[PDB]
Each structure stands twice: as C-alpha cells, then as structure tokens.
Design a protein around this motif. Structure first.
Motif, PDB file in Angstrom:
ATOM      1  N   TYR A 166     -21.379 -34.085 -16.305  1.00 53.24           N
ATOM      2  CA  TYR A 166     -22.307 -32.993 -16.007  1.00 53.24           C
ATOM      3  C   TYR A 166     -22.194 -32.671 -14.520  1.00 53.24           C
ATOM      4  O   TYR A 166     -22.863 -33.273 -13.682  1.00 53.24           O
TER       5      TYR A 166
ATOM      6  N   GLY B  42     -23.224 -30.291 -12.481  1.00 56.24           N
ATOM      7  CA  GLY B  42     -24.146 -29.278 -12.006  1.00 56.24           C
ATOM      8  C   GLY B  42     -24.275 -28.045 -12.869  1.00 56.24           C
ATOM      9  O   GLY B  42     -24.957 -27.099 -12.466  1.00 56.24           O
TER      10      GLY B  42
ATOM     11  N   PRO C 113     -21.722 -34.095  -4.225  1.00 57.79           N
ATOM     12  CA  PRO C 113     -22.034 -33.420  -5.493  1.00 57.79           C
ATOM     13  C   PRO C 113     -21.319 -32.079  -5.592  1.00 57.79           C
ATOM     14  O   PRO C 113     -21.095 -31.403  -4.588  1.00 57.79           O
TER      15      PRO C 113
ATOM     16  N   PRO D 182     -22.373 -29.333  -7.072  1.00 58.95           N
ATOM     17  CA  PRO D 182     -23.270 -28.210  -6.825  1.00 58.95           C
ATOM     18  C   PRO D 182     -23.494 -27.973  -5.339  1.00 58.95           C
ATOM     19  O   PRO D 182     -24.005 -26.915  -4.962  1.00 58.95           O
TER      20      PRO D 182
ATOM     21  N   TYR E  60     -27.306 -21.091  -4.324  1.00 59.81           N
ATOM     22  CA  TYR E  60     -28.443 -21.890  -4.771  1.00 59.81           C
ATOM     23  C   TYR E  60     -29.515 -21.026  -5.424  1.00 59.81           C
ATOM     24  O   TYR E  60     -30.174 -21.459  -6.376  1.00 59.81           O
TER      25      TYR E  60
ATOM     26  N   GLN F 228     -27.838 -20.017  -9.131  1.00 59.30           N
ATOM     27  CA  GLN F 228     -27.005 -21.061  -9.721  1.00 59.30           C
ATOM     28  C   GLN F 228     -26.828 -20.868 -11.222  1.00 59.30           C
ATOM     29  O   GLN F 228     -25.891 -21.420 -11.810  1.00 59.30           O
TER      30      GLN F 228
ATOM     31  N   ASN G 114     -25.260 -37.242  -8.220  1.00 56.87           N
ATOM     32  CA  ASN G 114     -25.771 -35.957  -7.776  1.00 56.87           C
ATOM     33  C   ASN G 114     -26.718 -36.059  -6.591  1.00 56.87           C
ATOM     34  O   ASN G 114     -27.375 -35.068  -6.256  1.00 56.87           O
ATOM     35  N   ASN G 115     -26.819 -37.225  -5.955  1.00 59.73           N
ATOM     36  CA  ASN G 115     -27.605 -37.354  -4.737  1.00 59.73           C
ATOM     37  C   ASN G 115     -26.946 -38.301  -3.740  1.00 59.73           C
ATOM     38  O   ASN G 115     -27.638 -38.947  -2.947  1.00 59.73           O
TER      39      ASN G 115
END
Ligand SMILES: *[C@@H]1O[C@H](CO)[C@@H](O[C@@H]2O[C@H](CO)[C@@H](O)[C@H](O)[C@H]2NC(C)=O)[C@H](O)[C@H]1NC(C)=O
Ligand SMILES: *[C@@H]1O[C@H](CO)[C@@H](O[C@@H]2O[C@H](CO)[C@@H](O)[C@H](O)[C@H]2NC(C)=O)[C@H](O)[C@H]1NC(C)=O
Ligand SMILES: *[C@@H]1O[C@H](CO)[C@@H](O)[C@H](O)[C@H]1NC(C)=O
Ligand SMILES: *[C@@H]1O[C@H](CO)[C@@H](O)[C@H](O)[C@H]1NC(C)=O
Ligand SMILES: *[C@@H]1O[C@H](CO)[C@@H](O)[C@H](O)[C@H]1NC(C)=O
Ligand SMILES: *[C@@H]1O[C@H](CO)[C@@H](O)[C@H](O)[C@H]1NC(C)=O
Lengths: 330, 188, 50, 150, 50
Positions: free
Chosen positions: A80, A82, A161, A163, A181, A184, B181-182
């Motif tokens: 996954y 983003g 990341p 994204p 952002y 998105q 993701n962080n």
C-alpha cells in the motif's frame, strides 16, 4: 488543471553473439583444402579476434545498463504505497518465472530449423546473464526507487514514504507541494488508470516493438545470405570442392580452387566488416540507455524533451528481449 | 556429369554399408564425410540426387538397393580452457562448447577426437551446463562473486589438495529497506 | 634409442642467441594455451583453443 | 565554514591515497594501454603479412623474375599483388572504425571539460558517484585523466 | 496449340518436392515485385524493381 500521462520508449541494448569456424565454412568436409588455406596467412586469426571482441562487448553493454546497483533491494510484504497500484510492474510470485505482468506482454510480442541449416560452423553463443538475473536486476531498481527514492544512486539508501517522495518531484518542476497533498485523491486515480491504458496499448498491435524486432531480423537474415554464398561458383566449374579434385589433376586445381578460396574469403570479410558497423550503433544506443538509467530513473531530469514529453516526474524500467523499455511519467 | 542416375560407370568395387557411424562414402562419384541415417522423403522416379539451399547434396539413393538415405556431418564444436594464472597453479578445465556430452565423454578410441589431450574424459567428474559440459571441474552450489565467466550464469574460480570449482553467479548481498509510512532517515 | 615425430615447438631465445626453453602445443591444454598466446605465462582467464 | 578544518584535512588525506591506486596494479591504466597495443599490433600484422605466399611460388619479388620467364609471370605476380592490396584495404578500413570510436570519446572528454571542470553538472552520475563538487584535468599519453571530487 | 518465349519464372516447391505454385516476372508490376523480392506476399510500401 493538470493531467499526468505515461509514455514509453524502446531501445536496443545488445545483439546476438556469433562464432564462425575458419575452415568448416571454406574447406568443409575436406582435408586437402586445409593445407592450401594455411599459406594464405593470418586472415583466419583476425576474424576470430574481431568476433571475440564484439562478443565480449555484448556482456559489457548489459552490465553497464542493468548492473549499476550493488545491493539487491526488495519491496516489503505490504503493498500500500499511499494509494497507487504498483502490481502491474512489480513481479508476481504466483508465476513460475518471477516476472511482472507487463513484462509478460513484452516477451510474447517479440519472437526469437534455425540450426539444422547451420552445419557450416555458424554458431550463436549464449549470453552470460540469463533472462532470470536480468529480471532480478530490474526488480531491484523498482524496489529502491519506490522505497528509498533517488538517494540510493549516491551512496547510502534512505527510506522515505512514497506519498512524500511525490511531493519532492513536484517541487523540482516549479509547482509547490500543496498541489499534491490537497489533491491526493484524483492524482492517485489518474496514475492507476494511465498504467492500465498501457496494458491495452501494447496488445493492440505488433508494430509497437519494431525497434527490437529489427535487431534480430537484421542478424537472422545476415546469416541466411552467408549460407547461400556457397552456391556461387566464382568462375570455377563447380561449387563443391569434392568435384574439382575428383575430375581433374592437381596441377590444374591449384588455380581453379584458388578462385573459390579468394572469393569465399572475401564473402566472409564483408560479413565481419558489417558487424563492426552494427556494433558501433548498438554501443551508441547502449550508452544512451545507460545515460537515461543513470539520470532519468535515479533522479529527476531538467532537460526538456529528454525523459518525457512535458515536465518529468520519474521513470520505471522494464526488461525486454535484447533491449530495455522505459515508462516515463510526465 | 552427374545430374541423373548413372548407367556406364568405371571399375572399382562394392563394399558393404554401415549406418549411424562417421565413415567416408563414394556413392557413384560423390565423396564426403558423414553419417548415413534412414530418411523418409519420397523421391520422384526421375530424381536421385537431392539438394538444399546451400547447393550441397544431402539425400542420395544407394545405387545397389532402393533405400533413401540422408547425409549429415559429424559432430564438431569449440574448445575453451578455463585456467588460473601460471604462477598460481597448473590445473585447467576444458570446456566443450555446444555439445551434449552423452557420446563425447567416451572420447578415447583409435584416433577419434582430433585433440591429443583426451585423457580428461576418464579424469574428473563432468558437469553439464546450458552451453556445453565442462570436463575438469566440480559443481558446488553455494554462491560466490564471479571471477571467470563461462556462460548462462555460471562462473568458475580457484578454491583454496585444491581444485577449481564452478558455481552459480551471485548478483550481490540481499538488502531490505524497512519501508513504512512514517519513517525518514537523514544522514548526519 | 628415441624416435622423432613432426611437431610444432615454441622456442625461447636469450640475448646471445641460445635456446633456453621450449614447449609444444599438442601435449597439455595449458601447454596449448601457452603455445597459442606466444608466451610462457598466461593470465587467469578463458582462452579460445583450436 | 563551521567545519573548514575537517573539510580541508579530509580532502588532503584523500589525495594521498590516489598515488598508490594508480600504481597498485597494471590494470588501472588499461584504457590507455589498449589504445597503444591496438595500434602496435595492427602495424605488426601488416608487416608480417608481406612474407605470405598467397598461393604463389614464393613471397620474394625478385626471385620470380630471376627464375621464371616473362611470358606467364603476370598471372604468377597477380596472385601476390592482389593479396597485398587486400591487406592494405583491411588495415585502412579498421583505422576508420577505430577513429569513430575515439571521436565518440574525444567528444565525451570535450564535454566533460565543460560541465565538470567549468561548473557543477546537475546530471546525476556523470562527473562522479554522488553529488559533484569540482574536477581537475590531468594530461596523459594519448588521453586525459580526470580527478573528480565528490 | 501455343508458342513459348524465353522468360524467367519463380517456382515454389512444397514439402513433397512438387511444383504447386509459380509466378511470372514480366506480366504486371506486381509480378515484377514478387520476382525481384523472391517472395509471394509483398508488404505495403514502395519497391525498387528492375
Ligand atoms: C481537473 O481535471 C480532472 C481530470 O479530468 C477532473 O477530474 C474529473 O472530474 C469530473 C467531474 O468533476 C469527473 O466526472 C471525472 O471522473 C474526473 N476525472 C477522474 C479521472 O476522476 C477535475 O474535475 C478537474 N478539476 C476542475 C476544477 O475542473
Ligand atoms: C491495484 O489495481 C489492480 C487492478 O487490477 C488491483 O487488482 C485487482 O484486485 C481486485 C481485488 O484484489 C481483484 O478482484 C481484481 O481481479 C484485480 N485485477 C485483476 C486484473 O486481476 C489491485 O488489487 C489494486 N491494488 C491495490 C493495493 O489497490
Ligand atoms: C602471480 O603473482 C602473485 C604474487 O607473486 C601470486 O600470489 C599469484 O598466484 C599470481 N597472481 C596472478 C596470477 O594474478
Ligand atoms: C543429452 O542426451 C541425452 C540422451 O541422448 C538426453 O537424455 C539429455 O536430455 C540430453 N541433454 C539435454 C540437455 O537435453
Ligand atoms: C548443496 O549441495 C550439498 C551437497 O550435495 C547438499 O547437501 C545441499 O543440500 C545443497 N544445497 C542446496 C541449496 O542445493
Ligand atoms: C500507515 O500504515 C499502517 C499499516 O500499513 C496503517 O495502519 C496506518 O493507518 C498508516 N497511516 C497513514 C497515515 O497512512
């Protein structure tokens, strides 16, 4: 408003190696011609040396383009990123051969009694890097340009990341970060739909892969012209060497066969001197692919009309038979 | 000369017939060197000497009986030598390019294979790869960096009572970036 | 009582012009590789042979 | 400015180890060595090809006329001239192929003299592995050698 | 009853060695293209016959 488009470009990287036998071509199935050819000198060693140098460089072009990363990376078990769908380009473990979905189309579009007519010592050597480890090199470029970004081309690979990496590709174009952002949702759907349109575009017609087909078509028809040079008589009374010696004396065949040898040796010198021309064009195109794979995918390019038609974001390489295929997003 | 079946012909003598063995043939004036298998092409009654694209005869009719044969050349391939340096060792490994070694490992006979160093076939154990089996090396299966290329992703080396080995190419050490993701790593 | 045969021999000459070392092609594949590179030392690599 | 002493010392130590690397082994300068060995071997095969018979009686020119008569020496000497004339066309063609290889590399060095030396090239992996800083050209026999600082 | 002329033909042989098809060379320009390309299914494009 803006649109994101995906365009492809197809390049050759290498051609097929060839080895030619000094005597089974000229004086094949005979032993008296082997003595006459020995006194002509070193034509035979120069042919072997040139063809071995061409055949070494075919494994230098492939190592220059694909093998520029030291450690092989791998994607995490989760997929996954983003909101983008990368299943079309990452490999599928369910297949017996670990190859991607798009790469399966590229193999079937290009097509490689091809050796029964080659009893005359015309042999094609196999490449050093087979189609499995080539498909593992191009599955490590995609596993680092997704997780690490562009930082693995300059030393240590740093996680980021996806994204957030996309917010740095927009910042290198001229538009700010907030265009991604704040939008998105629809940007993600344009990227997935553009990749799905690529799948139908490749299977629409077989004329899209003409740049790679002419690599194997030029080589295959070059050998077929060479195996029908034996039918030419070159002024001799026959085109077979076992009829000249069996019908007339030795003092007369020394000038009859000398006309055949100096003609068949000329037909082999024309063949090698055309391969040096073709090898100098592939290397002029392997260095163009090695430039793009070191600049367009390992970073963002600011050259207009070099990566993609428009402002460039990233690229995704794919492995093809005797070539590479890029997917430049714009 | 020979375009049709002959009827006159000179003296000479007739001597048996063998199949699937590299011999010399003089069937009606055509000399050569090869094996004579059994064919299935149906000749027309006025056609005897078959041909091909390269203007070399490959289908003949035995003058004495009515059998239809085929002419194919004997085996032939390249030879390469896999060696370390002269001042390191003296052992080698002969690579027979482009042959399936089910008949060439027999090797030794009354002057068959033209090279004189055919003693290796009775020596070390052979190992088959995709480019023709090499005689004089053993196949380990653990990975190493490539030192000398052979073909189809097989690279040999000089492992150190020490003999050379052949293995599978290793592209590099496997790495796995802990994607999330962080997570951001900044160099210091 | 030995016996001679036709062979190809590589011979090394010194400064004065005396034969100091020799080798033959048709004995050892290492000797054949020495005899086809025109040297008594061969670097670690694959080499084509007859 | 906050790390001037560490930057200066680390570049100073980096130039110390570059002397040993070019003299550690003979394969460091193999690119320029291949230029001079290709030309020296090409000249040697041209001179040594003069002694080949090319199907004639002898490779010496004067002994053909001194032993064999002039009525049919023309076909005996045409077999030797055509062999030697073919050997020059093979030599002059391979120089044309090799000159295009150098010209594709004499224009890459003429380019790298402009972005790497007279500025910073933003093309990644062009003037070194990493972020490029500067360059220093150094001459060499039949070539040039760059010292990229990265 | 008909009269023959000195011409050139292109003959295609099947796997049984029997002439199943042939094409003339000086009938219409398509026959000239098939004659000069040594084929039967010429592709779309401009060609360069005699
Ligand atoms: C900017 O362009 C995009 C691309 O067409 C627009 O997104 C479409 O919007 C219409 C109606 O708003 C939908 O029916 C489409 O399905 C959308 N496309 C996709 C791919 O989802 C977007 O609306 C435009 N923005 C503005 C302000 O006009
Ligand atoms: C990204 O898009 C692809 C489009 O094919 C998705 O694959 C589909 O997944 C659904 C549910 O998993 C299946 O019912 C479909 O059959 C799949 N498509 C095909 C052609 O087989 C994929 O799941 C998407 N991935 C993410 C993370 O959204
Ligand atoms: C020859 O030289 C070194 C040291 O003299 C020796 O250890 C090694 O076996 C050889 N090196 C090669 C063949 O590269
Ligand atoms: C070599 O031949 C044997 C029998 O002739 C056969 O079983 C084997 O499969 C062949 N090798 C390959 C790679 O097909
Ligand atoms: C490698 O070979 C050894 C000895 O034959 C064997 O014990 C081992 O299981 C093999 N490993 C693999 C991964 O094939
Ligand atoms: C990050 O990923 C985890 C698991 O993949 C998920 O539970 C979480 O909601 C994600 N957070 C964001 C901000 O995407």
């Amino acid at each position: 408003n803006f649109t994101i488009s995906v365009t492809t470009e197809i390049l050759p990287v290498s051609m097929t190696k060839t080895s030619v036998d000094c005597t089974m071509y000229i004086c094949g199935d005979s032993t008296e011609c082997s003595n006459l050819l020995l006194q002509y000198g070193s034509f035979c060693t120069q042919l072997k040396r040139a063809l071995t140098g061409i055949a070494v460089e075919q494994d230098k072009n492939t190592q220059e383009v694909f093998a520029q990363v030291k450690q092989i990376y791998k994607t995490p078990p989760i997929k996954y990123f983003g909101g983008f769908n990368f299943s079309q380009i990452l490999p599928d473990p369910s297949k017996p051969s670990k190859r991607s979905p798009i790469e399966d189309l590229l193999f079937n579009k290009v097509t490689l009694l091809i050796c029964a007519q080659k009893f005359k010592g015309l042999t094609v050597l196999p490449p050093l890097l087979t189609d499995e480890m080539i498909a593992q090199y191009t599955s490590a470029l995609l596993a680092g340009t997704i997780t690490s970004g562009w930082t693995f081309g300059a030393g240590p690979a740093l996680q980021i990341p996806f994204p957030m990496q996309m917010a740095y590709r927009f910042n290198g174009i001229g538009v700010t970060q907030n265009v991604l952002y704040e939008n998105q949702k629809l940007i993600a759907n344009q990227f997935n739909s553009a990749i799905g349109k690529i799948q139908d575009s490749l299977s629409s017609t077989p004329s899209a892969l003409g740049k790679l087909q002419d690599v194997v078509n030029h080589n295959a028809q070059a050998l077929n012209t060479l195996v029908k040079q034996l039918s030419s008589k070159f002024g001799a009374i026959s085109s077979v060497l076992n009829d000249i010696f069996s019908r007339l004396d030795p003092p007369e065949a020394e000038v009859q066969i000398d006309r055949l040898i100096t003609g068949r040796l000329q037909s082999l010198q024309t063949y090698v001197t055309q391969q040096l021309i073709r090898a100098a064009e592939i290397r002029a195109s392997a260095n163009l692919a090695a430039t793009k794979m070191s600049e367009c995918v390992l970073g963002q390019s600011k050259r207009v009309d070099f990566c993609g038609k428009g402002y460039h974001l990233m690229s995704f390489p794919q492995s093809a038979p005797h070539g590479v295929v890029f997917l430049h997003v714009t | 000369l020979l375009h049709a079946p002959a009827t006159v012909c000179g003296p000479k003598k007739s001597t048996n017939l063998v199949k699937n063995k590299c011999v010399n043939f003089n069937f009606n004036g055509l000399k050569g060197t090869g094996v004579l298998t059994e064919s299935n092409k149906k000749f027309l009654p006025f056609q005897q000497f078959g041909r091909d694209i390269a203007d070399t005869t490959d289908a003949v009719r035995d003058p004495q009986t009515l059998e239809i044969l085929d002419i194919t050349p004997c085996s032939f391939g390249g030879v390469s030598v896999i060696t370390p340096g002269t001042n390191t060792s003296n052992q080698v490994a002969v690579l027979y390019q482009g042959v399936n070694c089910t008949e060439v490992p027999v090797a030794i006979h009354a002057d068959q294979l033209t090279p004189t160093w055919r003693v290796y076939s009775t020596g070390s154990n052979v190992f088959q790869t995709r480019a023709g089996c090499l005689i004089g090396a053993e196949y380990v299966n653990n990975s190493y960096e490539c030192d000398i290329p052979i073909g189809a992703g097989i690279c040999a080396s000089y492992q150190t009572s020490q003999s050379i080995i052949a293995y599978t190419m290793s592209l590099g050490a496997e790495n796995s970036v802990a994607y999330s993701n962080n997570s951001i790593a900044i160099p210091t | 009582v030995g016996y001679l045969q036709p062979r190809t021999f590589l011979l090394k000459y010194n400064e004065n012009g005396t034969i100091t070392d020799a080798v033959d092609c048709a004995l050892d594949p290492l000797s054949e590789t020495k005899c086809t590179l025109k040297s008594f030392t061969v670097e670690k690599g694959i080499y084509q042979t007859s």
